[PDB]
From Swiss-Prot, chain A:
GO CC, any one term: U5 snRNP
Residue(s) carrying Phosphothreonine: T257
Top-level division of the source organism's lineage: Eukaryota
Family as reported in the entry's similarity comment: Belongs to the AAR2 family.
Subcellular localization(s) per the UniProt record: Cytoplasm; Nucleus
Positions of region (Leucine-zipper): 244-265
Role description: Component of the U5 snRNP complex that is required for spliceosome assembly and for pre-mRNA splicing. Involved in splicing pre-mRNA of the A1 cistron and other genes that are important for cell growth.
Sites of Phosphoserine modification: S236
Protein name: A1 cistron-splicing factor AAR2
Organism, as annotated: Saccharomyces cerevisiae (strain ATCC 204508 / S288c)
Keyword Phosphoprotein: yes
Swiss-Prot record, chain B:
Region (RNase H homology domain): 7-237
Full protein segment contained here: 1836 to 2069 of 2413
Protein name listed in UniProt: Pre-mRNA-splicing factor 8
Protein's cellular compartments: Nucleus
The record's note on its domains: The MPN (JAB/Mov34) domain has structural similarity with deubiquitinating enzymes, but lacks the residues that would bind the catalytic metal ion. Contains a region with structural similarity to reverse transcriptase, presenting the classical thumb, fingers and palm architecture, but lacks enzyme activity, since the essential metal-binding residues are not conserved.
Subunit relationships: Component of the U4/U6-U5 tri-snRNP complex composed of the U4, U6 and U5 snRNAs and at least PRP3, PRP4, PRP6, PRP8, PRP18, PRP31, PRP38, SNU13, SNU23, SNU66, SNU114, SPP381, SMB1, SMD1, SMD2, SMD3, SMX2, SMX3, LSM2, LSM3, LSM4, LSM5, LSM6, LSM7, LSM8, BRR2 and DIB1.
Effect of D22N: Reduced growth at 30 degrees Celsius. Strongly reduced growth at 16 degrees Celsius
Miscellaneous comment in the UniProt entry for this protein: Present with 468 molecules/cell in log phase SD medium.
Function: Functions as a scaffold that mediates the ordered assembly of spliceosomal proteins and snRNAs. Required for association of BRR2 with the spliceosomal U5 snRNP, and the subsequent assembly of the U4/U6-U5 tri-snRNP complex. Functions as a scaffold that positions spliceosomal U2, U5 and U6 snRNAs at splice sites on pre-mRNA substrates, so that splicing can occur. Interacts with both the 5' and the 3' splice site, as well as the branch region. Has a role in branch site-3' splice site selection. Associates with the branch site-3' splice 3'-exon region. Also has a role in cell cycle.
Length: 300, 237
């Protein structure tokens, strides 16, 4: 069980740790989060009390280093930093744990919700999308645009998701125009799975990464990417059976976790009705259709 | 974007464009089977591709053999249309290729866009105008070449005959749309107007009669009259 200590909490902030969130008051004696499970990737996110604009945060894996959070009063945000002196870090964490100034990542017997949301998210894979090589953790905020959004303006601060465009020459074989447009299996299985991702594990990971960025940061580019990756599978007549079954499980947990009050904006009516009711896979997503119909029957 | 009454003179500027109408590509007769069920039998069709500035009509004839053993023919027809327009464009020299292609029905946008991905600089556009190009098959010479075709064929016409020698393309398109709108609302009365007089003939190389300027005013007046008598009878006026 690992620890993300905090230098201080000088500004009032709502702090997010995976699917959980808690409030810290201005100058409250808060010195971080302990008992963070090892073996899972994590996200620590931030929403200042004084400015609801700019949810921002850090994706990280405790196995890759000792990380702490310290407020920067010049740039005005909580920053993640790496302490390479392992003894100083051990010495600091133990002091905060003795004075009980750290909140504890909850440990309930009935839970696998974070695992189900992050099954194919990896820290090294994350760095291919969010480029900042000198750090082991990856910063994301609400406003970061995607490479594709930048095609439709700072490239260093972008989200490099895999571009998906259904009316593109990559998507459409010359002479197979109607076939490939109406049945996207070529684009899914050959262009994307066999030539870009390499395996479905990777397809599922970027999709999972896209959903969490959309949900935790309100990143419009991430939301577009998540729906595009769902739509490509559901618009394909030929999809391996194991991929359909996992997709159903993946989506089920995303819909289950989505805050009810943001469904209206987080879920694209057209993509979901098409996927559940018109597409080739309309009959293949039993768990997802059941939770969607019982929880958000208005969107449909 | 979409073409309407507000940007209507753009049809007659010097940017090459083509209208594509697909309403006569897939044509059938519905009939009863010996068992008392219903069946269709396809008949020859055509793509109506028109340059509104020059009057140049690229009539691609769609022979019934193109449907043999195919499924979902109304969907296929849109994709077959787009395949054939794309092939036409590619067959033209670069300086003759259109800058824009206007489809008369919005269901043609995605098929044409996908077939023209190689041409990113050609704009594929819809229109809010309710143009009467479906009545193209009420033109006797166009109907004749479609129904006699025994194989796929492209035939070229000028749908304005020699009118551009005497009137502008804006006026020529107006006259064409008026004639076609009349043919669509009552074809018999329309054709009686056009052909009642046995001394005005259609030249071998023309589609419409050789009307003098004054006779065209009379003709055009008679077509308006016909369109109003039925537009008003519709809603009893
Ligand atoms: O060094 C620290 N802060 C000053 C450097 O800016 C520091 C290091 C690690 C932890 Cl946990 C806390 C503070
Ligand atoms: O849930 C928390 N606070 C109360 C919410 O009602 C919370 C969540 C996570 C941690 Cl790590 C600490 C407190
Ligand atoms: O493999 C990925 N896709 C990009 C390939 O360029 C991937 C996998 C997992 C995550 Cl979390 C993100 C991207
Ligand atoms: O469409 C969005 N917002 C409503 C317009 O104000 C939207 C959708 C998804 C995300 Cl993640 C963010 C914004």
């Amino acid at each position: 069980m690992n620890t993300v200590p905090f230098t201080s909490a000088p500004i009032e902030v709502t702090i997010g740790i995976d699917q959980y969130s808690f409030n810290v008051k201005e100058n409250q004696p808060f010195h971080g989060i302990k008992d963070i499970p090892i073996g899972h990737v994590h996200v620590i996110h931030f929403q200042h009390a004084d400015n609801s604009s700019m949810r921002y945060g850090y994706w990280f894996d405790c196995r890759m280093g000792n990380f702490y959070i310290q407020y920067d009063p010049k740039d005005g945000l909580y920053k993640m930093m790496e302490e390479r002196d392992g003894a100083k870090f051990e010495n600091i964490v133990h002091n905060f744990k003795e004075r009980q100034m750290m909140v504890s990542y909850p440990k309930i017997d009935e839970d696998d919700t974070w695992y189900n949301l992050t099954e194919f998210v990896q820290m090294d894979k994350i760095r291919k999308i969010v480029r900042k090589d000198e750090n082991q953790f990856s910063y994301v905020d609400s406003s970061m645009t995607t490479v594709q959004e930048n095609e439709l303006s700072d490239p260093a601060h972008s989200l490099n998701y895999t571009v998906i465009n259904f009316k593109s020459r990559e998507a459409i074989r010359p002479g197979h125009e109607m076939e490939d447009f109406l049945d996207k299996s070529y684009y899914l299985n050959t262009v994307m799975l066999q030539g870009i991702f390499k395996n479905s594990s990777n397809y599922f990971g970027e999709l999972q990464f896209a959903f969490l960025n959309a949900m935790f940061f309100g990143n419009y580019g991430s939301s577009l990417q998540w729906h595009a990756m769902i739509e490509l599978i559901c618009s394909s007549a030929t999809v391996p059976k194991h991929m359909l079954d996992k997709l159903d499980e993946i989506l089920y947990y995303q819909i289950k976790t989505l805050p009810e009050q943001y469904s209206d904006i987080l879920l694209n009516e057209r993509v979901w009705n098409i996927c559940l009711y018109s597409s080739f896979q309309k009959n293949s997503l039993h768990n997802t259709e059941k939770i969607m119909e019982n929880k958000y029957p208005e969107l449909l | 974007g979409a073409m309407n009454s507000s940007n209507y003179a753009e049809l007659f500027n010097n940017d090459i464009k083509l209208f594509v109408d697909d309403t006569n590509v897939y044509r059938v007769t519905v009939h009863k089977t010996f068992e008392g069920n219903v069946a269709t039998k396809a008949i020859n069709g055509c793509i109506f591709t028109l340059n509104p500035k020059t009057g140049h009509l690229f009539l691609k004839i769609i022979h019934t053999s193109v449907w043999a053993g195919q499924k979902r023919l109304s969907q296929l027809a849109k994709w077959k249309t787009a395949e054939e327009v794309s092939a036409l464009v590619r067959s033209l020299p670069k300086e003759e290729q259109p800058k824009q292609i206007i489809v008369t029905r919005k269901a043609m946008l995605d098929p044409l866009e996908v077939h023209m991905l190689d041409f990113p600089n050609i704009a594929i556009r819809p229109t809010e105008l309710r143009l009467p190009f479906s009545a193209a098959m009420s033109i006797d010479k166009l109907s004749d070449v479609v129904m006699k075709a025994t194989e796929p064929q492209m035939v070229l016409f000028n749908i304005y005959d020699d009118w551009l020698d005497r009137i502008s393309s804006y006026t020529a398109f107006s006259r064409l749309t008026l004639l076609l709108r009349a043919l669509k609302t009552n074809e018999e009365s329309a054709k009686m107007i056009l052909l009642s007089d046995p001394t005005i003939t259609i030249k071998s190389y023309h589609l419409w009669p050789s009307f003098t300027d004054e006779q065209w005013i009379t003709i055009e007046s008679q077509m308006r009259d016909l369109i109003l008598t039925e537009y008003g009878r519709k809603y009893n006026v």
